[PDB]
C-alpha cells in the first residue's frame, strides 16, 4: 500500500493564519509516491478547498452517523462531500475521550462514511491505565472489532493508531513501541477480516509526530504513514513530514 | 419590553446549491425593521452565507466549544465563529441535550465562555414527556436556567429558547396557551434568581414547531418575544413571513 500523511490541524486556524498555512502548502515540493490529506476545521474547509492545490486532499474531522435532518450543531457525510472532501476522521482520541463517543457509534459513522463514498481514516488507541493494565492490544481489537462488524468494505480504509498513553502522560512512545502496535493490528486484519485487506490497508502512525522524528518512524516495517498532530499546522515541517517518504526507501 | 427575536435554526441540512437560493429568497424578502432576525446555518456554510447574505440578518453557529480552541478534533472555537462574522451561538439545543448527551453545567460552561468572548447567546431549555407527564416541566426547565445563571458573567446578550421536547415528535401537540404558561414562569424565574430588570429585558422566545400558519397566533402570547423557527427556516419566504409575524403582536 501507498504512503499515506495526513494532517490533523484539530480545532486551531483563523482565515488569515489558514491563508499562510495554504501558501506555505502550495508552494512546497512534495514527494510524488504519497498520498497526502489535510483536515481543516469545519468553517474554514472552504476556503481551503477554494485555494489548496489539488495535489492534496481535504478530509472531514468528524461526521453525523448517518443523513441530515433535525441534528443541531452536527454535519453530515454528504455536506463534507458537497464542499470537496475524500475523508473524514473517525473515532479519533479525543471524541471517544474528550467527547465520549463509543465504539459502536463511532463503528456506525464509518459504516455509513464508506457506504456514501468517503474515504475513512479510522483512529484506534489505548489510554495510559489501560497500557498500565497490560490491556493495549485488547483495547485495540475491540475497536477495530467495532469497525470490523460494520463497515461494508476495507478498501477506503485508513487505519491511525494513537498511543493516547504516550499523549500528554508525560510518557513518550519509541519507534519500536509503535512497530509493535503496527503489527499486531495488521495481524488482526489478518485473521479477523482476510489476507488481501491486510496487506493493501494501510496503518498510519497517530503519535507525536514532527521533523525530528519522522524520518526516524518512516523506517518502520508497518508504519506505513503519519497521521500529524501540532507539525500539521507549520507549512514547511509539514511538508518535510511527508518527504519523509524518502526515509522508508534508504 | 425586548425586541422581537427570530432566529432560523437550519440543524443539519443544506447544501452550497439549496443555500444559495435560500439567501436569495431571503435578500430579497422586505423584513419588519424592529425585528432582529438571525440565520443559523451548519459550520461548512457560514463562510458562504456571510459573504451573500444581507447585513440586516445576523449569523449564528448552531453550537461552540466550552473553551479555548486546541487539541478537539470535530470541535469548532467562539473565536473561529467570531472569524468567520457570526454574531450568536445556539446552545444546549435539545437535539445536542438529547441526542448527543451534553448535560447541562457544560452546556452553562460553553454560554459563560461564548458571551465573555464577545458572543451573543440563544441558551435553549425544555423538558421530556416522560418529564411532563411526572410533573417535572419546571424542575428540568428551572434546573436547566440554574445551570446557565450559575455560569454566564451577564444576561445583556442573552435570548432564552423554551422547547416543548414533550411535542417534538411524541404525537402530543402544544398550543399557543401552554407555551405562553411555560414563558410566563420562567419569565419569573428570571425575576426572582436575576433581577427584575433582567426578567423583563431578556427575550423569552418559542422553540416548538414554527410555521407560516400559526406564528401570526402564537406572536400574539404575552410572553412569546420571537421564534427559533426549525423546518420551515429552510423555506426562504415562509421564514421572512414568520418574520414579519411581529405585526400580529402590535394587533
Given at each position: 500500500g501507498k504512503f499515506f500523511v495526513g494532517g490533523n490541524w484539530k480545532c486551531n486556524g483563523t482565515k488569515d493564519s489558514i491563508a499562510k498555512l495554504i501558501s506555505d502548502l502550495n508552494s512546497a515540493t512534495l514527494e510524488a509516491d504519497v498520498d497526502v490529506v489535510v483536515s481543516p476545521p469545519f468553517v474554514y474547509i472552504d476556503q481551503v478547498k477554494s485555494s489548496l492545490t489539488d495535489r492534496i486532499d481535504i478530509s472531514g474531522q468528524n461526521s453525523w452517523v448517518?443523513?441530515?435532518?433535525?441534528?443541531?450543531g452536527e454535519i453530515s457525510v454528504e455536506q463534507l462531500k458537497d464542499l470537496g472532501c475524500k475523508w473524514v476522521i473517525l473515532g479519533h482520541s479525543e471524541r471517544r475521550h474528550v467527547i465520549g463517543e463509543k465504539d459502536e457509534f463511532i463503528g456506525k459513522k464509518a459504516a455509513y462514511a464508506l457506504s456514501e463514498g468517503l474515504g475513512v481514516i479510522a483512529c484506534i488507541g489505548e489510554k495510559l491505565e489501560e497500557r498500565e493494565a497490560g490491556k493495549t492490544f485488547d483495547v485495540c481489537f475491540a475497536q477495530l472489532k467495532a469497525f470490523a462488524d460494520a463497515?461494508?468494505?476495507?478498501?477506503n480504509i485508513v487505519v491511525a493508531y494513537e498511543p493516547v498513553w504516550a499523549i500528554g502522560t508525560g510518557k513518550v512512545a519509541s519507534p519500536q513501541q509503535a512497530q509493535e502496535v503496527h503489527v499486531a493490528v495488521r495481524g488482526w486484519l489478518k485473521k479477523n477480516v482476510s489476507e488481501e485487506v491486510a496487506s493493501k490497508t494501510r496503518i498510519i502512525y497517530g503519535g507525536s509526530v514532527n521533523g525530528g522524528n519522522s524520518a526516524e518512524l518512516a523506517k518502520?516495517?508497518?508504519?506505513?504513514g503519519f497521521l500529524v498532530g501540532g507539525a500539521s499546522l507549520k507549512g514547511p515541517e509539514f511538508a518535510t513530514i511527508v518527504n519523509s517518504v524518502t526515509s522508508k526507501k534508504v
Open positions: 448517518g443523513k441530515g435532518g433535525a441534528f443541531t463497515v461494508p468494505s476495507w478498501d518502520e516495517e508497518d508504519i506505513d
